[PDB]
Amino acid sequence: VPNDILEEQLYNSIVVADYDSAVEKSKHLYEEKKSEVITNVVNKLIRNNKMNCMEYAYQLWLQGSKDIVRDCFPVEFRLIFAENAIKLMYKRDGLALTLSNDVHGNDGRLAFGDGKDKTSPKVSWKFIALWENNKVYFKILNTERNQYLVLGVGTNPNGDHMAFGVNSVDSFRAQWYLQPAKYDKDNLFYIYNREYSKALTLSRTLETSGNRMAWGYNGRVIGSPEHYAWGVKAF
Amino acid sequence: VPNDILEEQLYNSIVVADYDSAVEKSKHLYEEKKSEVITNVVNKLIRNNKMNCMEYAYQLWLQGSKDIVRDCFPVEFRLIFAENAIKLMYKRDGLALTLSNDVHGNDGRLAFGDGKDKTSPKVSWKFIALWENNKVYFKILNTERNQYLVLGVGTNPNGDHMAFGVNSVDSFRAQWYLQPAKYDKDNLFYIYNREYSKALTLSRTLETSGNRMAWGYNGRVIGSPEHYAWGVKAFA
C-alpha cells in the first residue's frame, strides 16, 4: 500500500478522533520504517490547524509511543507532553508570558507578556495534560509561582477576560486546549480557555514598561497565527 | 489678649470642628498681623496629625481666606485646594503614583507607584475637594486619563484593597480623606479611603519593572509617615 494512501488512512482516523486506530496505525508505520508517513500526516494536521493533532500526540505519548512523538512531531509536542519547562512566546510581540510578583487582589497574580524578561525563572511554565471525553486539556503551571493560568470571570467592554495565575485548578477556567498552526518556519499554538473557548492573547495596549496584559480574547483568531498564536520554547 | 491664649483658642475651635469659629478667629488674627498665631496652630495640628486641619484649610479657602492658606500653611494645602497638577510621591520609596495603560476590566486602570517615571503627564493628579457633613473629602483625579482613584471591593489575604483609576465617582470607594504629618522637613499626608478607612500605600513587593502596586492597606500607619505617607509636589 503506497505512502500517500497510508497517509490518507492515518490522517482520516485522526480527523474523526479515533485515536486508538491512529496509534495502532502509527505503531505499524514506525515499526515498518515508514515514519515519513507519520511526519507528513502531522505536517498536514498542523497546516490545517487540526486540534485533534494534540490528542493524537497525547495518545501516542500515553500508549507506548513516546518515540513517535520524539521523532515525528515538532519539538513542541515532546516539550508539552514531557511537562518540560518551557516559555510561552507570543508570536506577534516576541514576549514571554509571566506572572506579576504581587497578587491582583482576590484574583491571583496578573498574567502578562513581559516587556523585557525573556529568560528568568519567572517566564518558565509547564503544561500538565489531562484527558477527558476524547479530548486533551492542559493546566498551564507557572513554575516560579506554582500557580495555574486562569481566565477571570469578569470581562472588559469587548467581552475579553483577564488572565491570572491562581493556586488551584478547581474550574474549567483554569484548563486550556491547543490548536496547532504553521507560520513560515515555526509551529505555533492557539491556546484556548476550556471554560470560555477564548484565545489567550496579549493586549495591543503597551504598558510604559513594555509589558502587555494577557487576555482571553473575544474575537476570531483562526488564520492569523502571526497575530494570535504562541510558540512553545524550551526553557 | 496674649498670643499663646489666642493659639489655644484657635486650636481648640479646630479640634472640635467648629470651622466657622476657626475661620472668624483666623480672619481677625490675619487682619491684626498675628499670622504667627495661625502658623503656629497649623504647625501644631500637623505635628499632632489632626485630620481637622484639612477642613480648617478648606473652610478658610471657601470663606474668602485663600490668602491665609497661602501664607500660613504648608504649600501642599494651596496645591490641593487650588487643584494644581501635582504628583503623589510615596515617601518610603520616592515613587510617583500613576495608572496603567490597559484597563483591568470593570476594575479600571491599575494604580501603582512607577519605578522610573517621576516626571511625565501620566503621574499628574489633581485633588478635587468636596464638603459633606463637616468633613472634606477628595476625588483624586489622574489628569491624563481623566480617571479617579478608587479602591476595589476584593482584598488580598491581608485584607488590603487594590487601587484603580475609574471613570466616575459614584461611590465612597472613590473618595479620600487626608491626615497631615510631619517628617523632618517634609509635610506629608496619609491618604485614607472614605469607604474602607484604609490608607493608600505602595506594595513592599517590587514588580520586575520596579513598579509597586498601590493598595488600600489593612493596617496601622499613624506614627510612621516615612513608611506610609505621601508627598504632594507641584507637577513640573
Instruction: Tell if the CB–CB gap between B203 and A107 is shorter than 8 Å.
Output: no
Strands B109-114 and B161-166: antiparallel
Name beta bridge partners: A189: A180, A230
Which residues from B are below 8 Å from A93, CB to CB?
Answer: none
User: With 0-12 CB in 10 A as exposed, 13-18 as middle and 19+ as buried, what is A185?
Assistant: exposed
What burial letters (b/e) apply to A75-112, b meaning 16+ CB within 10 Å?
Answer: ebbbbbbeebebbbbbbbbebbbbbbbbbbbbbbbbbb
Neighbours of B131 (CB within 10 A): 13
Name beta bridge partners: B86: B125, B234
Radius of gyration of chain A (CA): 18
Alpha-carbon distance of B38 to B74, in angstroms, equals 12
Whether A208 and B101 have beta carbons less than 8 Å apart is answered as yes
Alpha-carbon distance of B47 to A82, in angstroms, equals 63
Q: Which among A140, A160, A135 has a CA at the least distance from the CA of A150?
A: A140
Alpha-carbon distance of B80 to B58, in angstroms, equals 9
- The answer for residues whose C-beta is within 8 angstroms of residue B227's C-beta and 6 or more apart is B91, B92, B221
Crossing angle for the helix pair A35-47 and A52-62, to the nearest 10 degrees = 150
Alpha-carbon distance of A60 to A79, in angstroms, equals 14
Alpha-carbon distance of A153 to A155, in angstroms, equals 7
Instruction: Tell if the CB–CB gap between A203 and B102 is shorter than 8 Å.
Output: yes
Chain centroid offset of residue A151 CA:
15
Alpha-carbon distance of A55 to B51, in angstroms, equals 64
Which residues from B are below 8 Å from A211, CB to CB?
Answer: 209
- What does this entry list as its resolution, in Å? 1.9
- The answer for residues whose C-beta is within 8 angstroms of residue A104's C-beta and 6 or more apart is A110, A164, B104, B162
Show the 3-state SS of chain B. Answer: CCHHHHHHHHHHHHHCCCHHHHHHHHHHHHHCCCHHHHHHHHHHHHHCCCCHHHHHHHHHHHCCCHHHHHHHCCHHHHHHHCCCCEEEEECCCCEEEEEEEEECHHHCEEEEEECCCCCCHHHCEEEEEEEECCEEEEEEEECCCCEEEEEEEEECCCCCEEEEEECCCCCHHHCEEEEEEEECCEEEEEEEECCCCCEEEECCCCCCCCCEEEEEECCCCCCCHHHHCEEEEECC
Ordered structural domains, chain B, with CATH = 1-74 (1.10.10.2400), 75-236 (2.80.10.50)
* A144 has a chain B CB within 8 A of its CB: no
* B152 has a chain A CB within 8 A of its CB: yes
Instruction: Tell if the CB–CB gap between A104 and B162 is shorter than 8 Å.
Output: yes
* Residue of B95, B101, B173 to mutate, interface with A, max A Cβ within 10 Å: B101
The residue written with cell numbers 484597563 in the block is: B103
Alpha-carbon distance of B137 to B66, in angstroms, equals 18
Whether A202 and A113 have beta carbons less than 8 Å apart is answered as yes
Q: Which of A103, A115, A155 sits opposite B105 (nearest CB)?
A: A155
CA-CA distances (angstroms) from residue B224 to B54, B76, B171?
Answer: 19, 19, 29
Q: Which among A66, A43, A41 has a CA at the least distance from the CA of A180?
A: A43
Strands B186-193 and B95-103: unpaired
Q: Which of B162, B208, B211 sits opposite A122 (nearest CB)?
A: B208
Q: What is the dihedral of CA A58, A60, A64, A65, to 10 degrees?
A: -130
Alpha helices in A64-223 (DSSP H): 66-72, 75-81
State the method: X-ray
Q: Which among B129, B130, B126 has a CA at the least distance from the CA of B147?
A: B126
Alpha-carbon distance of B224 to B111, in angstroms, equals 22
Q: Which among A210, A114, A202 has a CA at the least distance from the CA of A162?
A: A202
Please report the sign of the dihedral spanned by the C-alpha atoms of residue A218, residue A130, residue A225, residue A122: positive
Alpha-carbon distance of A23 to A30, in angstroms, equals 10
> What is the enclosing helix (H) or strand (E) of A4?
helix A3-15
Local structure of A154: helix, strand or coil: strand
Main-chain dihedrals φ then ψ at residue A188, nearest 5 degrees: -120, 170
Local structure of A95: helix, strand or coil: strand
Phi-psi category of residue A80: left, alpha or beta, with phi > 0 → left and psi -120 to 50 → alpha: alpha
Q: What is the dihedral of CA B98, B100, B103, B104, to 10 degrees?
A: -90
Main-chain dihedrals φ then ψ at residue A165, nearest 5 degrees: -115, 125
Which residues from A are below 8 Å from B206, CB to CB?
Answer: 101
* A206 has a chain B CB within 8 A of its CB: yes
* B225 has a chain A CB within 8 A of its CB: no
A161: nearest CA in chain B? B105
Please report the sign of the dihedral spanned by the C-alpha atoms of residue A154, residue A158, residue A159, residue A163: negative
Whether B199 and B216 have beta carbons less than 8 Å apart is answered as yes
Alpha-carbon distance of A141 to A160, in angstroms, equals 21
Which residues from A are below 8 Å from B203, CB to CB?
Answer: 102
Main-chain dihedrals φ then ψ at residue B159, nearest 5 degrees: 90, 15
Q: Which among B172, B171, B222 has a CA at the least distance from the CA of B201?
A: B222
Name beta bridge partners: A155: A161
DSSP classification of residue A195: T
